[PDB]
Every structure is written in structure tokens, then in C-alpha cells.
């Protein structure tokens, strides 16, 4: 067989029913992101004369 | 003579600030055929 990948000829045994040289590449990506931020202020005063 | 003067005073304040963001991405891809160098690419 001539492999269309790695670009070479190869020999096969009578033990293998089929050696194919198809290519498939299947990719799945998941990227998930969070960010959060807070700020707070309180003040009081109580006064006399 | 007698005189007296008196007072009381009070004050309050607040401030708040807030932020959030969220992102999500997915990719799914099937390549069939290629040399796996560029099928990879």
C-alpha cells in the first residue's frame, strides 16, 4: 500500500483483513469562563453640643 | 439670669460598585481526509 500520510510505501501481512489509509481527525473544545468583582462602603456619625 | 442652648445632629452615607462577566466557547470539528500534519492544522 502507498500511505497518503507520512508519504511512504508499506508491506501488509495475510493476518490483516484490511489496512486502509483513511484519515480522520475529530476535535472538540469547550472553554468556560467566569469573573466577578464587588466594592462597598458604609458611614455613620452622631454628634452633640 | 439663667440661659441654656443645646443641639444634636446625625448623618449617614453608603456607596456600592459591582461587576461580573461570563464567557463560554465550544468548538466541534470533524476532519475527514488530509495528511494528518494539516488535518491537524
Residue numbers in the entry:
A (entry chain C): 146 to 194
B (entry chain B): 393 to 433
From the manuscript:
Soluble MAC (sMAC) is an immune activation complex that is formed from MAC assembly precursors released into plasma and scavenged by blood-based chaperones. In accordance with lower resolution studies, we find that C5b supports the assembly of complement proteins (C6, C7, C8, and C9) into an arc-like arrangement of MACPF domains. Similar to MAC15, sMAC contains a single copy of the complement proteins C5b, C6, C7, and C8 while the stoichiometry of C9 varied between one to three copies. As the molecular weights of secreted clusterin and vitronectin are ~80 kDa and ~75 kDa, respectively, we attribute this excess to multiple copies of both these chaperones. These data confirm that sMAC is a heterogeneous assembly comprising a single copy of a conserved core complex (C5b6, C7, and C8) together with multiple copies of C9, clusterin and vitronectin in a mixture of stoichiometries.
Given the extensive cross-links observed between the chaperones and C9 (and Source data file), we subtracted density corresponding to proteins C5b6, C7, and C8 from the raw EM images and focused our refinement on the C9 component of the complex. In doing so, we resolve a 10 nm stretch of density that bridges the negatively charged crown of C9 lipoprotein receptor class A (LDL) domains. This density caps a similarly negatively charged polymerizing face of the C9 MACPF and sterically obstructs additional C9 binding. We also observe a second belt of density below the C9 epidermal growth factor (EGF) domains. We then plotted the location of complement protein residues in our 3C9-sMAC model that uniquely cross-link to each chaperone. We find that cross-links between clusterin and C9 congregate around the two extra densities observed in our focus-refined map. By contrast, unique cross-links between vitronectin and C9 lie on the back face of the map. Taken together, our data demonstrate that clusterin likely occupies some or all of the extra density present above the C9 LDL domains in our focus-refined map. The electrostatic surface potential of the clusterin core model reveals a contiguous patch of positive charge, complementary to the surface charge of C9 at the interface with clusterin in sMAC. Density for clusterin at this site is the most well resolved in the 3C9-sMAC maps; therefore, the interaction is likely secured through repeated contacts across oligomers.
